[PDB]
Structures are given as C-alpha cells and as structure tokens.
Design a protein around this ligand. Structure first.
Ligand SMILES: CC(=O)N[C@@H]1[C@@H](O)[C@@H](O)[C@@H](CO)O[C@H]1O
Ligand SMILES: CC(=O)N[C@@H]1[C@@H](O)[C@@H](O)[C@@H](CO)O[C@H]1O
Ligand SMILES: CC(=O)N[C@@H]1[C@@H](O)[C@@H](O)[C@@H](CO)O[C@H]1O
Ligand SMILES: CC(=O)N[C@@H]1[C@@H](O)[C@@H](O)[C@@H](CO)O[C@H]1O
Ligand SMILES: CC(=O)N[C@@H]1[C@@H](O)[C@@H](O)[C@@H](CO)O[C@H]1O
Ligand SMILES: CC(=O)N[C@@H]1[C@@H](O)[C@@H](O)[C@@H](CO)O[C@H]1O
Ligand SMILES: CC(=O)N[C@@H]1[C@@H](O)[C@@H](O)[C@@H](CO)O[C@H]1O
Lengths: 131, 131, 131, 131, 136, 131, 133
C-alpha cells in the first residue's frame, strides 16, 4: 500500500487533513477538512483493498462521509460511505441516497472540505501524492 | 475459484446473505436475501466453472432463481436458474421464461433481494469482493 | 479437442442427447434429440478437425443432419451434413439445399431438437460446456 | 507446402478431382472436375510459391484454366491461367481477358467444375482442408 | 532520473529560460527568471522533479515559481501549486490557480520578458526541453 | 538483394524484358519491353537501396524512364527517372515533369511496355516474383 | 556518429542540396547553399545532429542556416532556431520564426535556386534524406 498526501489541484496549497477533536488527532469521529500541506501523519493516507482511505494518525481510522456530507475519521467498516475511487483527478465516494447523484470530494469554501454533488463540485481536483 | 462477498453498490450497507430456513443456514431451499455486511460464511460465495455461485454455508448449495423471482440455495445442478454472469457491476441470471427479458440481481425494497427484468432493475449494482 | 456437453441457453435445462434406437445408444442411425442434462456418455461431444461433432457413445459416430432436418449419429465421412460451426452462441450446419437458408441447431416445441432455417430459429442458443 | 483437399461448400459432397484420361490420372492434359470426397492422391493439392495448385497425382501437374474455361492438369509454367488466390471461401483465377471480369472456381452443373465470371458464379464456395 | 535540460523557446529564434539572479549573483532565493540567448550554463539548466517542480541547477533548493503578478522567480522548494508544471505538447503549463477560470502558460510577453499568461492569450508559448550535458 | 522477375498480372504471360540493341542485351541504352516469361538474365531484376531496378544482363544497367516515356537500361545514377517504388501491385516511377502526375509501369499494346499517367494506366498490375 | 546523407529533391529529377561556398572554397563561413546535380562529394553530404542541425561535411562547425531573406548558407553551429530542421514525410521544415506566422519549408524556387518558402506556397518542396554509407 502506498502512503500518499491528498493534495488539492483546485487550491494553491491545501491537503486533506485530520483536524481531530480538541488537539487530539487520534480520536474516532475526529473532523477532516483542509490545511496547508506539511505531510505529517494527519495528512498521510493509504487506500486499502476495501477502497477505504486509512489515516496514519492511528489504527482503524478511515475517511468517512457523514449524513450531512461532512468528513470525519471513524473505525473501518463495510459501509459505502467509507469507500472511494478515482476518476482522473476526481475522488469519488460510493455513498448513495435518493438524489441520484455521485458525491465528489470538494472544497466548499475556505478550508472546508466535504462531498458535493458531481454537477456542482467546482473545486474537486485532487492529486494522490506519494510520500 | 475465488471466495467473495457480493456487496451492493446501490445500498450503503447490503450484502447477499443466506437467511436459511428457520434460522438454519445449511438447509436446501433456504432463503437468500440482503443483510448488513459481516463476512460470515453465509455471506461468502464462489463462482464455479459451471457459472454457479456456491455458498460457503455447506457443500452443494448454489444460488438459485425461483419461479416467483425470489432466491434460494439449492443442490447444485445444470439448470440455467443457477447460472450467473457479470456485465460490469450487473449480475445477470441465465434464467429464461416467456418474457424475452434478462433478469438481474436486484434490491426490490428494504433488504429484499430478487431478480428483476433488466429494464426495471434500478438497484442492481454489485461488487464481488475478495474475502 | 475439447469434450463438451451442448446445453441450450434457450431452455432452462436441455442438452443435446443421443437417444439411440430401441434402447441401444451405440447404433449408427441412432436418434439425437433433447434431454435434461446429466453429462453422461450419451451427452458428451467433441468437435474434430473436420468440423464434425463426434459422440462419446461409440467410435465413429458423428452428429448428422438428415433430409427431414432431424438429427442422428452416423459413421463419420466428408458430407456437409456432418459439419458444424459456431457464430457466438449459434451452432450452424454447413448443410446446403435449394431453400436459400442456413440451418441452425434449434429447439421446436419443448422436447424436439432439430435444425431450423435461420430466420425461424427462435431457440437456437447453445453453450459448449467442458467436462 | 501444405497439402489440401479442395472441398465445395456449395454442394454437400464434392471435391476437386483429377479425372485423368482413360483411367490414367497422371497424364498431362488430364481433365479436372468434381467427385465425392475420398482424399486419395488425385484429390490432394498443394499451393506452391508461384500460386499454382499442384496435384499429387504425379510430379509437374498444375491446375490450369483452359480457353473454354474447363480445367485440366498441365505441366507447370508461368501463365496466369495456372495462378490461383483465395478471398474468403472464393478461389479465384489470375486469368485475364477482355471481359472485365474475375473468374471463380465454380460448380456449373452436376459434378462439372469450371471457372465462371464472378457475378454469375453461384456455387463457388470452397474450403481448403488440410490432410 | 531527473534529466538536465535547457528550456528553449520555439517562438523566438534564440531564447532560453534564464535565472537572472540579482546584482550578478545567480544563486539568490527570490531571484528573477526571464529569457536570454542560449548558452547552456547552470543558470539555464533545469530539471523536473517528482513533485513536478522545475529545479534550477544554479544552487540547491531553487524552484521555478509563479509569483502573484505572474512574473517568475526561483524560490526555496515547497508544496505550492505555484511551483508545479506540466507539459502538453510544446506548452509548459503551471498548476497555479485563481479566480479567473484559466490555465497559465509559460509565455514570452515581449523582448526577453517571460511570464505566465492566460492560455487563450499565450501567443509565444512554445518550448522545447533540450537535454543538456552538465559539467560538475 | 532479392532477384526477381517482374511479371504482369494484366496479361496472361508477360515479363519485363531487356530487348537490347541489335541483339546485344548488355548495351547501355538498350530497349526494355515485354516478352513471355523464361527467367533468363535479361528478365531478372533487383531493387537496390537507391530504388533502382538493376538488370542482370550486365553490371551497371538500371531501368530508366526516357522523356518519350519508353524504357531503357542505362548506367546507374541519381536521376529520379531511375527510381521506382511499389504501391500494391503498381510500380510507380519517381520521374517528374511539369504535368504534375505520377507515371506507372504499364502495358500500352501487345508487348510494348512504357510508363503511363496514373489515371490512364489500365494494364499496370505487376508481381515481383522471386527467382 | 551521424549518418551520411545527401538531401535529394523528389520535385526535380536531379537536384541535391549543395554548398556552393565562395570563389570555389566550399569551407567558408557564410558560404552559399543552393542546388546542384547529385554527385555525393562532401559539399553535398550532410548529417543531422542531436540539436536538429544539418552539419555539412565540408569542414568542422558548418550548419545549414536560414537567413533573414530566406536564402541558405552554412555558418558556425549554435542554438538559433534558424539552424534547426525537422521532417514531416518528405517535407524538410525549418524552426525559423518571424512576424509572418508561417512555417518555412526547404523549397526549390527556380532552376538550381533553393531557399525556404512559406508552407502554403512551397510547391517544389519534397526531399529524401539519402543514405550514402
Ligand atoms: C502539524 C499539525 O498537526 N498541525 C495541525 C494541522 O494539520 C491541522 O489539523 C490543524 C487543525 O486545526 O491543527 C494543527 O495543529
Ligand atoms: C452472523 C449471522 O449469521 N447473522 C444472520 C444474518 O446474516 C441474516 O441471515 C439474518 C436473517 O434473519 O440472520 C442472522 O442471524
Ligand atoms: C439417465 C439417462 O442416461 N437417460 C437417457 C437419456 O439421456 C435419453 O437418452 C433417453 C431417451 O429415451 O434415454 C435415457 O435412458
Ligand atoms: C478412388 C478414386 O481415385 N476414384 C476416382 C475418382 O476420384 C474420379 O477421378 C473418377 C473419375 O471418373 O475415377 C475414380 O477412379
Ligand atoms: C554567461 C551568463 O551567465 N550570462 C548571464 C545571462 O545568462 C543572463 O542571466 C543575464 C541577465 O542579465 O546576465 C548574464 O550575465
Ligand atoms: C532467351 C532470350 O534472351 N530471348 C530474348 C527475349 O527475351 C527478348 O528480349 C527478345 C526481343 O527481341 O529477344 C530474344 O532473343
Ligand atoms: C563537383 C563539385 O564540387 N562541383 C561544384 C558543385 O557541387 C557546386 O558547388 C557548384 C556551385 O557553383 O560549384 C562546383 O564547383
């Protein structure tokens, strides 16, 4: 498995970053958003055999689409909300709902990163960058 | 032969699952429907050389299309109702009837899984996943 | 040479089968038709270098189209009535006559296998199946 | 050089056959026509580097278009009337004349084989069959 | 392996991308980059690294960098898209982004001045990376 | 270099032939025309690296297009009138004039062989045949 | 080790690119280049180097050069696009640029005169790099 940073190509310096909870980067349920690139453990990810992006902050922390379309790290499971695949420079969630849309990883403003309907995902270019 | 789980890509957590008959998963004629993924043996399957999906619940149990379009596990034979092939993420039965239609493995509501005429199969995406 | 059964994809359970004559399945001139699949000696065939389908029932027995379009096993010779080729899942005779048509291995009714002019051959899908 | 029989696909049992003259199959000028296939030497042919079809009846016997469009075996020379090429199942002579036409090996009635203008050659399908 | 190249214009009969430096010193961080006639010295040799940065051979840790005013400098190497470059045929394209919905191309904007320019206006923007033997 | 006869496919027996001058096949300026095929040295040719067809009649004799479009053998030089290339069964001269047409080796009547404008070259099929 | 080629026209039955030189001296810098019948002497032999220059065998350091007025000379070798050449099929195309926004092609412009000509006017512009060795 390749350890990578997930660096935005829609912003001059933003990487996908485990904010954590109250300084604690290792906590289950910790928030994920954007930050200037520095490649510390909370910015390194690995894509496993189940299409989950595992964080290097600790064991058993997977990038997770939440109901409100925000991002956290959570214990790894089988949910499609934890599955990801690439199409060119688009990073797409396998998450499904009644809206008949694919959801793309996308900068929604400032350092906020969420998933956004494909048609409306305007800052959704990423590069998996080998550490 | 590769042992796989058959996970839905049309539902955020559904796998093809041997319910059995009265809690007994090994019974011939036991029901097959959907359930959340946990990869126990009643959710593991193997596609043999005769295009049958063998269940790991016990020997000689093949995924079978019934006349009412529901699914069971039965003793393995030559019937087309036990034969399956992939097209992309669609899992297609070789079963024929008087409808000039192919039948696709499909979620028809809740955790109910059946085969549905191709034109009407709108929750019929699956991913075979190595165990 | 691959030894196969010839199973219909147009009928849920029918294989090309040597019936024989009066119980005797080794006799030249023995009848060929449809039966449920069991893979026993009288359902096993092999396509030779001369495009003949040889039967496992005895040496020197070839699948043969007759005048009236029924099928028998006969001694192997050079006649086009004994030559067969595949186009996708269609199995076609090289037999010629004055009727401006190709003849396809086909099911008419439910139990009777014969060859049929192509344009009327509505249940003519087959699968050569190893073992 | 691969030796073949030249079997018709427009007739259920006809091969190109050196008749000879008065029982002698080896004689120069000997007639060529059709016969049921038996694969003896007077039905075996080889395409040489000059595109001549050499008969196995004897040395130096090539399939030759005569001025009346009948066929004989003759001593091998450079004339286009001895040159042949395939195009699908059509076997075409390089013979030229003022008729703006290609001449195809063709059954013209019964066991008579001649070459015929392409737009009128109705029984002109052949298959070279390896021995 | 990183190839040492000159970046020669195909839109001007004799212009290479060149570290001007400052005050005669070609090694300074923040030194200007523009065009000059080709001579292939170290301040004209470049190498594309695994992070898509064009490193100058003039000194360690000098990367071709798009500035806010679209001029070019060499700067200490980091992660910013302003230092990332990719080829499409003979166009050398910056990964720099802003609100103008455009790609920026390496472009001669007049005389020996080289900047990046919006794609639809980049008329002297053809380049050839040319393998250059480097003397130690 | 591969020695060939240049045999016509537009005439049942014609090969490109060095006639010579006064019975002498070796003379520079000797005429080239057609003749029945016998494969003696005045009918054997070799295409060299300069695209010249060298005759085996004698050293330093190349097939040459003359201003009047007749053919000779001449001392080998650099002129395009001595260069030839194949497209399919057409043999084309590199010869140029102000008419902006390509010239093809062509039978123009009986055993007369010349070069002819491409559009009008109707007996211009050739086969380079290995000796 | 550059392959020895002549640059022979396919638009004229016998014309090669040829260093005329000056007053019989084929080695001189700024020597004129035009056409002549093909004889393969060193003033007609060329080599394409790694910088896309056609070097003449008349002397060290002599490259085929497009001049401002579109005539051709041999000159000391340098980096100028005016000395760079590439092939597309039987067209030999210069990298020279100017204000006209055209590619320039090696072209016969009358008798033995060879220049470069704008692409869409170049009617005697077919060439074959012909191997000598
Ligand atoms: C080096 C490091 O961990 N820095 C983190 C940063 O990546 C980001 O997560 C931020 C969120 O507020 O907090 C910082 O402490
Ligand atoms: C771990 C396990 O076997 N769980 C099964 C489940 O897969 C499903 O078959 C369900 C049907 O009602 O019954 C459960 O007991
Ligand atoms: C089990 C078995 O072999 N059954 C054969 C069947 O294949 C078919 O040929 C039939 C025709 O009457 O005869 C049976 O004896
Ligand atoms: C076995 C054999 O060679 N049979 C030949 C047959 O091929 C055919 O040429 C025929 C002509 O009338 O004569 C037979 O003797
Ligand atoms: C030999 C050399 O380095 N020449 C440089 C040139 O490359 C360019 O940078 C110029 C900037 O004004 O200064 C010159 O001194
Ligand atoms: C064997 C031989 O060389 N025969 C030549 C023939 O090929 C042709 O050139 C003819 C023209 O008149 O003259 C003959 O003498
Ligand atoms: C054999 C030889 O070198 N002849 C040259 C010719 O190549 C050409 O350069 C010409 C220009 O006027 O001058 C001649 O002296």
């Amino acid at each position: 498995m390749a350890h990578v940073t997930l660096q935005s190509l829609s912003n001059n310096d933003l990487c996908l970053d485990v904010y954590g909870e109250n300084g604690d980067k290792t906590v289950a349920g910790g928030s994920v958003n954007g930050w200037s690139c520095h490649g510390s453990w909370n910015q390194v990810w690995g894509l496993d055999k189940e299409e989950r992006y595992r964080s290097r902050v600790a064991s058993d922390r997977c990038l997770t689409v939440n109901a409100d379309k925000t991002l956290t790290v959570e214990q790894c499971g089988a949910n499609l909300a934890q599955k990801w695949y690439w199409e060119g420079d688009k990073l797409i969630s396998r998450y499904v709902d009644g809206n008949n849309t694919r959801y793309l990883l996308n900068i929604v403003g400032g350092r906020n990163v969420q998933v956004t309907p494909e048609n409306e995902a305007n800052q959704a270019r990423w590069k998996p960058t080998l550490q």
